[PDB]
């Protein structure tokens, strides 16, 4: 909509107060002009119809319940945006400033969050799984994340190159829950998952193995459930990240762990100049190495620890 820029306040799914960018005409519309082309927000009214209407609020407050699933996806999609540009020079999910549209309020009692293709689609959960979606940054950066990975790799979602997507995902999800530094951790989902449940969360990238999840090829899933296990495997190539960054001596094989900024650095590169559409997890190895290389040198430390961690998890 056409309209002034405006800067209302309002609460989210866990009951923080943020401020969220604006369009005001007659009503104020979560329209935020600041970042690219547009951060839209939308309701879907409960429906399954898409995007449904601009979001149309009369005062500019969002302290409403049925606001805060709104505030959140607006407001998480707009760190999203920062995360990427400040950190990787990547202007939306495109590369070029693509407008970020989300849905919220979608269905009723919808255990989930995905993008569709287009935008952003968000349940409100059945409040015993989970509660609404948006509310987990992580859960936003990381379905925002399959968008750059299909404008990038086009890593296809089964087996494990699919497993790679859905690492991928987690590795971002998680590095822009640090980047926006409020309580992040190596967990994913832990702010909207079973809110009845304190310290849980739907899989672990520290540690797969405390949800049954996998830590090592080894244990890699080869069934045909979850794609081939897509959500399942992710936890080989998360363990290999978490220790890419904080180190650690798994299965008898020591990390010197170089932080969080140069794990994002390294896949970055390697999703966006390195991956393609069936990149195995050797391949996924390979082009890590090679990013690493192109970024440190050859005889770097963060060459070497991008080997010991992908020794670790037995990914040769
Ligand atoms: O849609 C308009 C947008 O294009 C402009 O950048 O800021 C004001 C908005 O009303
Ligand atoms: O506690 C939250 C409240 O602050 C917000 O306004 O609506 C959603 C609730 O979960
Ligand atoms: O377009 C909107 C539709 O998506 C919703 O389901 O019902 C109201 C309409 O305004
Ligand atoms: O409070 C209202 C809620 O009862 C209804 O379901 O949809 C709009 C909300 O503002
Ligand atoms: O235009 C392409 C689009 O069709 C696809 O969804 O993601 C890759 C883009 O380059
Ligand atoms: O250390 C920062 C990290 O926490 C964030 O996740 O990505 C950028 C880095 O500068
Ligand atoms: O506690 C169990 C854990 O040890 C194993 O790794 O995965 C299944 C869990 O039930
Ligand atoms: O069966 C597949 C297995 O061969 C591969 O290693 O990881 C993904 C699985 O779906
Ligand atoms: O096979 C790829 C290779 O061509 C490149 O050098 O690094 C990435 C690998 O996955
Ligand atoms: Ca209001
Ligand atoms: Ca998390
Ligand atoms: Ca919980
Ligand atoms: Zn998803
Ligand atoms: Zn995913
Ligand atoms: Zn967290
Ligand atoms: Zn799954
Ligand atoms: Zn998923
Ligand atoms: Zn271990
Ligand atoms: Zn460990």
Redesign the pocket.
């Known amino acids: 909509?056409?309209?002034?820029?405006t800067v209302g306040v309002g609460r989210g799914v866990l009951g923080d107060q943020k401020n969220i960018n604006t369009?005001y005409?007659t009503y104020y519309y979560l329209?935020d002009?600041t970042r690219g082309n547009?951060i839209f927000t939308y309701d879907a009214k409960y429906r399954t119809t898409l995007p449904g209407s601009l979001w149309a609020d009369a005062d500019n407050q969002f302290f409403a319940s049925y606001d805060a699933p709104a505030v959140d996806a607006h407001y998480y999609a707009g760190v999203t945006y920062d995360y990427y540009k400040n950190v990787h020079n990547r202007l939306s999910y495109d590369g070029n400033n693509a407008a970020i549209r989300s849905s919220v309020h979608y269905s009723q009692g919808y255990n989930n969050a995905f993008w569709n293709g287009s935008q952003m689609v968000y349940g409100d959960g059945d409040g015993q799984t989970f509660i609404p979606l948006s509310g987990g940054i992580d859960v936003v950066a990381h379905e925002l994340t399959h968008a750059v990975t299909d404008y990038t790799a086009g890593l296809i979602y089964q087996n494990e190159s699919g497993a790679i997507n859905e690492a991928i995902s987690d590795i971002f999800g998680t590095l822009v829950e640090f980047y926006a530094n409020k309580n992040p951790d190596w967990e994913i989902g832990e702010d909207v998952y079973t809110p009845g449940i304190s310290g849980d969360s739907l899989r672990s990238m520290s540690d797969p193995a405390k949800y049954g999840d996998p830590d090592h090829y080894s244990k890699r899933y080869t069934g045909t459930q979850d794609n081939g296990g897509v959500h399942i495997n992710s936890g080989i190539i998360n363990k290999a990240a978490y220790l890419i960054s904080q180190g650690g001596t798994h299965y008898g094989v020591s990390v010197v762990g170089i932080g969080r900024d140069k794990l994002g650095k390294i896949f970055y590169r390697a999703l966006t100049q390195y991956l393609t559409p069936t990149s195995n997890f050797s391949q996924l190895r390979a082009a890590a190495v090679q990013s690493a290389t192109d970024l440190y040198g050859s005889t770097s430390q963060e060459v070497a620890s991008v080997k010991q961690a992908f020794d670790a998890v037995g990914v040769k």
């Open positions: 909509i056409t309209g002034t820029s369009t005409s329209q002009n547009g």
